[PDB]
Design a protein around this ligand. Structure first.
Ligand code: TA1
Ligand code: GTP
Ligand code: ANP
Ligand code: GDP
Ligand code: MG
Ligand code: MG
Lengths: 451, 386, 432, 38
């Protein structure tokens, strides 16, 4: 029973959770009311996969989800929506104001009196679980709740459970586009928790996904629904290895064993290759080589960063559908001969491969074409440093004059939690710069004894 | 420094007296002569060793060697080498039931004690006599056996488990979780010796009533310290004294072994055969590069084929000064076996070690640089430039 | 009555064992449900080598299945021959090793090793005269490598006099499926060189090369690799089961192939292999099998024999054939390729002949080589090992589970010593 | 009055001694080779 508990914090977290749970319900043939007529039609089976859904006596299936936010609006949209009967009635929503783009308000003042209930319900979910693999936390940098309350919850979880993996999916601020004036402060103040407590953090950018939607899917006016659906596809590709049979299955521990060389560099990028519209699904073969090559194109990255400016440290490919090992081997072999893709000299292997038989599903009303093959790549590289550096600059431009600071100090913080965070960012950037340097020439300086 | 080689011949035992008692071993000076009983017409083959010892008759004075004689000749020399700061080893060799237990351990109740007790007593006397305000000494003991490719500890109380052999990157092989006991007086180490000899595995066979069943290694770690508050360095010297008693080769026909006693013997023979190869291999290499030209291209020594050769990697060659004591049997019936020992002994002297021994490489570098500064300053002063 | 206990560990070992039990089961004539439906009288004569006899005239294979992830076990049970195995031998836990050798050997496997050894002891006690074991696993993986090494160590501790075989799938230069393969491979090879009598080397690159070039398949899967490997395993131990003009027990192969204890890494091969299109053209005879066995491209280890020397080789033929032709062909192979054999082992070719071929063939042959070219493989791993160990690329995962740098260093030193021990005999002209 | 603090550095006495002795050896050798005494 490869059980995984999902936690959604903030508006971005709740909406990505809506998309994710729509996809999960469609994958296993669960109706919006929690019933599964597939078993009744067939007679019995294991289709109620215990990764996400828990089966009660009467044939209903309750998801292993925990939605949290400080605004009643975002989750009251779910309590009276299509999926109102699917979730347990307990949704952990503080009937008060919100963090208000304020890390201090979400971490110290209002984050209290809601953390205890959240931890209690997480404990109740964990008690029902046997062989719990880890957590999947969804949130967004730049928001008050998704920064402060996520920090508090991650701290408490690291205190309590400790050894269980805690993966992170977060929406990083874009370089140019933004939706708040105090995004850099909230983003920078979360580095301590996203570093010390998480085991692997996946970052995505709205500008990159908008570019992908405009260029590949030919959607000129996308909304957040398309972005959430793409992120849901990414998470499903990650988690499919422990729900369906396959030639090579990759658990959540193999992830961390293969992708993170050192504890402090666990920030891999993610990407999905066969992102294509229904009309353009024709005129294309969609073979293993094509999707595998498209995973490495800088235009297809989900974060505004150029891999050509850095070096690849580790790669994990997860294939779905009608795929065979020899095509994957040929794709990796032809990739290794390209000079535009550089690997660090101290990781000569540089690839982890997993294959799953279940092909990706299509959500009605969606925009992704039905395909026979797919691949999700997760790549730990050094180009991500750039994504920090720009944001770091922005932070300085506001902290030189102490703008917007009185709101933060008026809720419980002092200015030093505003420098300590900056120094931690600087140290992280120094680490990323140091790891990517080539080994010094003949690293034992030089050698050669008599004979 | 070449390996030192001693050979010794023992008197007749009951098995020899009951059967034909014709002697074949003769000794004169440093020369040991063996004569083929089956071919009296043949040449009296002879070998020149560093030391040879005749223990056949005690009243007479024909180069008779008591235990104290061999002890002075080999063990006292090697102990003096140890005091100068050199890792040191003495190991026994030959065939089953010849002389190893008598030579190395001896009979404790009698005055004819083996090399290990006399070395330990002289070492304790020297550390007690030469003690001073500045000088100081420390000593530590351990004792292990190799039974069937498995290491066991004797000085420790009953530990049914078998220890694990490991490899420090700089110091080479060692035995993990080995009870290294601190000792302070001759009586205490004597008690440890008695307990260790009791703990060994010994079984009776036709060739000998107390045939040893396991190789044994006795290690003494000695530390020599000089205290000075101004210039001198404490822990000036550290040395390792290794006395090795090997179970001898056996033949199933004469031994009469069956079942477990046979299987043990097989392992013993294996642990000897590999050892012989190593000795031969080592000799040729240290003969070849030294004499041939100096090429030093590549030569492989099969150290890893047995745990005995693995643990003694630094003893048979490298960073130690080593002596080899061969035990002979005067019986005519034993000739075809006895000569074999001599052959390997004849090769044993060819082996050449490489021992320097230092400590605290930071102090080594500092001392080297300071000595260079002093030498250059003295040269400048002598030539009028200082 | 000689017979073998069988152990399977990891995904690769489990799948290869499943395919192997389907092949052996045909030769002996065994229904998937367990009943016997053969035609020849000599199939049941020595069936006890692999199969225990149940009450209802059924036959249960003497297999042990080991893993830490339950999923593979399900794939064995929900298969063509899933019901043949007894449920009591399915030993498994939860929370697999995750490609971490430390978890497999020290932390997780240390708890399941007791149960696995209990089942192994139960199977071995009922044996009339236990010959030896054989283990199938992958060195470059997680639970497979670690638990295989641990079980090998324990069994050699408890059964020192019996043969301990091993079929290992090691990393490849180009084919790589895990980032941390060198660490697992190095530690596994350090464990195997001490505690094993025979170890057959298998590489995915060589099997894919055989499939593409020899068998001309277009879309090979792991089924074909398992097919080739299982054919090799059935070929190795033919002579315990069926009569022959000149038999060859496992101990005979071990004695004749191993000159020194640490040199027991073999290169396997099988003949004939014809692609299903050229079957009507070639004549099948002993010279053709001899030519195909010694061909460089037919080996399963991806190490060219031309880059070294053959310390020893063994040829096990199956079929009705003349001994004179076999001896003449082996002598001709020795004489013509004079530079690829060592000069201090005269007649370094073991020969065995069995009178019962496979069911669909008139003749067949298996080749077990022991050559210095295998050093190349180890060298490659060592190179990659250094490239990660000098910077400590992924060492925190291993040190967090209760290891240290010293084990890595001693494993690397042992591997280098083995690599040096092969080269010694590799060069010609022993004098200077 | 935020001012640059710099890093407080305290070198190891052993490394200092080794470096000083190496420099002294080099200087004395360059002196002795100069006066044609080496
Ligand atoms: C001769 C004929 O008309 O059919 C042959 C055939 O065409 C060939 C091509 C067979 C065929 O092999 C393959 O096509 C193949 C594909 C992938 C991997 C391995 C083999 C055959 O499939 C394989 C099959 O092999 C057997 O039946 C053996 O007994 C084999 N057992 C099994 O394959 C087997 C598989 C599943 C269940 C039960 C038995 C065996 C081999 C060694 C030791 C013991 C058993 C045979 C003779 C043939 C076909 C069917 C075409 C060959 O294989 C073997 C092992 O015999 C390919 O090289 C040989 C040469 C044969 O001529
Ligand atoms: N991809 C994606 N991003 C979103 C979505 N909703 C919000 N975001 C991101 O979230 C950022 C705003 O922070 P929020 O997470 O909404 O803050 P919050 O969770 O509402 O918490 P409060 O600030 O206290 O209200 C914006 O910059 C968006 O980029 C969404 O539906 N999809
Ligand atoms: N030179 C000697 N003078 C007097 N007695 C001796 C002499 N050499 C051996 N003995 C005795 O003869 C017997 C055989 O010697 P012993 O030392 O036990 O053989 P061993 O070296 O132990 N052979 P093994 O222990 O199997 O490797 C013992 O009782 C010894 O005390
Ligand atoms: N020949 C063969 N090799 C396999 C198969 N499955 C996996 N492998 C190899 O095994 C390696 C992965 O090891 P794995 O089975 O995951 O080890 P485990 O995790 O301990 O069970 C890969 O490098 C593959 O090349 C198979 O079915 N056949
Ligand atoms: Mg909000
Ligand atoms: Mg003795």
């Amino acid at each position: 029973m490869r059980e995984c508990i999902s936690i959604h914090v903030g508006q971005a977290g709740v909406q990505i959770g809506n998309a994710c749970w729509e996809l999960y319900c469609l994958e296993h043939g669960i109706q919006p009311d929690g019933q599964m007529p597939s078993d009744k039609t067939i007679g019995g089976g294991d289709d109620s996969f215990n990764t996400f859904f828990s089966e009660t006596g009467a044939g209903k299936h309750v998801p292993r989800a925990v939605f949290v936010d400080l605004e009643p609006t975002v989750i009251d949209e779910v309590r009276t929506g299509t999926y109102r009967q699917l979730f347990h009635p307990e949704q952990l929503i503080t009937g008060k104001e919100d963090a208000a783009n304020n890390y201090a308000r979400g971490h110290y003042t209002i984050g209290k009196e809601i953390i205890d209930l959240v931890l209690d319900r997480i404990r109740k979910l964990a008690d029902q679980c046997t062989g719990l693999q880890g957590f999947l936390v969804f949130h967004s940098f730049g928001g008050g709740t998704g920064s402060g309350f996520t920090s508090l919850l991650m701290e408490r979880l690291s205190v309590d459970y400790g050894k269980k993996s805690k993966l992170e999916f977060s929406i990083y601020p874009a370089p140019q586009v933004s939706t708040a004036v105090v995004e850099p402060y909230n983003s920078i103040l979360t580095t301590h928790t996203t570093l010390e407590h998480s085991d692997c953090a996946f970052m995505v950018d709205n500008e990159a996904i908008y570019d992908i939607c405009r260029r590949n899917l030919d959607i000129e006016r996308p909304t957040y629904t398309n972005l959430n659906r793409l992120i849901s596809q990414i998470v499903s590709s990650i988690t499919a290895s422990l729900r369906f049979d396959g030639a090579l299955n990759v658990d959540l521990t193999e992830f961390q064993t293969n992708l993170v060389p050192y504890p402090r560099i666990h920030f891999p990028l993610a990407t999905y290759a066969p992102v294509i519209s229904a009309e353009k699904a024709y005129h294309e073969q969609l073979s293993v080589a094509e999707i595998t090559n498209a995973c490495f194109e800088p235009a297809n990255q989900m974060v505004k960063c150029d891999p050509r400016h850095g070096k690849y440290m580790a790669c994990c490919l997860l294939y779905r559908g009608d795929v065979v090992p020899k095509d994957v081997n040929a794709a990796i072999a032809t990739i290794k001969t390209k000079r535009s893709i550089q690997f660090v000299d101290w990781c000569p292997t540089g690839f982890k491969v997993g294959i799953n038989y279940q092909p990706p599903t299509v959500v009605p009303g969606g925009d992704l074409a039905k395909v026979q093959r797919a691949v999700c790549m997760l790549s730990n590289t050094t180009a991500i440093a750039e994504a920090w550096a720009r944001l770091d600059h922005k932070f300085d431009l506001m902290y030189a004059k102490r703008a917007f600071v009185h709101w933060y100090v008026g809720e419980g913080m002092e200015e030093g939690e505003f420098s300590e965070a900056r120094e931690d960012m600087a140290a992280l950037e120094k680490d990323y710069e140091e790891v990517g340097v080539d080994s010094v020439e003949g690293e034992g300086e030089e050698e050669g004894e008599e004979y | 420094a070449s390996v030192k080689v001693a050979v010794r011949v023992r008197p007749f035992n009951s098995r020899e007296m009951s059967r034909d008692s014709k002697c074949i071993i003769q000794m004169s000076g440093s020369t040991t002569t063996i004569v083929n009983p089956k071919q009296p017409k043949e040449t009296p083959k002879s070998f020149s060793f560093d030391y040879s010892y005749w223990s056949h008759t005690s009243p007479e004075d024909i180069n008779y060697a008591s235990q104290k004689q061999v002890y002075r000749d080999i063990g006292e020399e090697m102990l003096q080498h140890a005091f100068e700061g050199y890792n040191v080893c003495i190991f026994a060799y030959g065939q089953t039931g010849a002389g190893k237990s008598y030579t190395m351990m001896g009979k404790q109740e009698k005055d004819q004690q083996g090399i290990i007790p006399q070395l330990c007593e002289d070492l304790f006397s020297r550390i007690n006599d030469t003690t001073n305000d500045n000088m100081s000494y420390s000593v530590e003991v351990s004792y292990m056996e190799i039974y069937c490719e498995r290491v066991r500890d004797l000085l420790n109380p009953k530990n049914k488990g078998n220890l694990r052999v490991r490899e420090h990157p700089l110091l080479g092989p060692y035995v993990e979780d080995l009870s290294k006991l601190a000792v302070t007086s001759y009586n205490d180490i004597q008690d440890l010796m008695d307990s260790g000899n009791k703990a060994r595995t010994v079984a009776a066979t036709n060739m000998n009533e107390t045939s040893s069943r396991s190789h044994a290694v006795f290690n003494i770690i000695f530390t020599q310290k000089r205290h000075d508050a101004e210039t001198n360095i404490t822990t000036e010297k550290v040395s390792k004294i290794s006395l090795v008693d090997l179970a001898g080769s056996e033949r199933a026909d004469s031994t009469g072994a069956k079942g477990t006693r046979l299987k043990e013997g097989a392992n013993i023979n294996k642990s000897l055969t590999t050892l012989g190869k190593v000795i031969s291999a080592l000799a040729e290499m240290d003969s070849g590069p030294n004499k041939n030209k100096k090429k030093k291209k590549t030569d492989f020594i099969p150290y890893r084929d047995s745990v005995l050769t693995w643990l003694l990697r630094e003893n048979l060659g490298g960073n130690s000064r080593t002596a080899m004591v061969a035990a002979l049997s005067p019986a005519d019936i034993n000739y075809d076996e006895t000569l074999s020992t001599l052959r390997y002994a004849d090769r044993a002297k060819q082996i050449r070690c490489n021992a320097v021994i230092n400590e605290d490489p930071n102090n080594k570098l500092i001392r080297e640089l300071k000595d260079e500064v002093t030498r250059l300053r003295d040269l400048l002063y002598a030539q009028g430039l200082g | 009555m000689r017979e073998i206990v069988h152990i399977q560990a990891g995904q690769c070992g489990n799948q290869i064992g499943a395919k192997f039990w389907e092949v052996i089961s045909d030769e002996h004539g065994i229904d998937p449900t367990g009943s016997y439906h053969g035609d020849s009288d000599l199939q049941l004569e020595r069936i006890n080598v692999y199969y225990n006899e149940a009450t209802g005239n059924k036959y249960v294979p003497r297999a042990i299945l080991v893993d830490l992830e339950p999923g593979t076990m399900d794939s064995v049970r929900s298969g063509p021959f899933g019901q043949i195995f007894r449920p009591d031998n399915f030993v498994f836990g939860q929370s697999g090793a995750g490609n971490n050798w430390a978890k497999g050997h020290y932390t997780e496997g240390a708890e399941l090793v007791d149960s696995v050894l209990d089942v192994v002891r139960k199977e071995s006690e009922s044996c009339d005269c236990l010959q030896g074991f054989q283990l199938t696993h992958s060195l470059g993986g997680g639970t497979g490598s670690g638990m295989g090494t641990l079980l090998i160590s324990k069994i050699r501790e408890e059964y020192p006099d019996r043969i301990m075989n091993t079929f290992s799938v090691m990393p490849s230069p180009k084919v790589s499926d895990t980032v941390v393969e060198p660490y697992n491979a190095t530690l596994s090879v350090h464990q195997l060189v001490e505690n094993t009598d025979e170890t057959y080397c298998i590489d995915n690159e060589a099997l894919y090369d055989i499939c593409f070039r020899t068998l001309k398949l277009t879309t090979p899967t792991y089924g074909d690799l398992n097919h080739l490997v299982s054919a090799t395993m059935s070929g190795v131990t033919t002579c315990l089961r069926f009569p022959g003009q000149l038999n060859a027990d496992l101990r005979k192969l071990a004695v004749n192939m191993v000159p020194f204890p640490r040199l027991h890494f073999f290169m396997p091969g099988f003949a004939p292999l014809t692609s299903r299109g050229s079957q009507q053209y070639r004549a099948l005879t002993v010279p053709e099998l001899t030519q195909q066995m010694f061909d460089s491209k037919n080996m399963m280890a991806a190490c060219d024999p031309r880059h070294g020397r053959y310390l020893t080789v063994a040829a096990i033929f199956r079929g009705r054939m003349s001994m004179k032709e076999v001896d003449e062909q082996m002598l001709n192979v020795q004489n013509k390729n004079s530079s690829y054999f060592v000069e201090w082992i005269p007649n370094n070719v073991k020969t065995a002949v069995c009178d019962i071929p496979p069911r669909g063939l008139k003749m067949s042959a298996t080749f077990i080589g022991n050559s210095t070219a295998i050093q190349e493989l180890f060298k490659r791993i060592s190179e990659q090992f250094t490239a990660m160990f000098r910077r400590k690329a992924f060492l925190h995962w291993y040190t967090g589970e209760g290891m240290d740098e010293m084990e890595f260093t001693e494993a690397e030193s042992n591997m280098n010593d083995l690599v040096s021990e092969y080269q010694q005999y590799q060069d010609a002209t022993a004098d200077e």
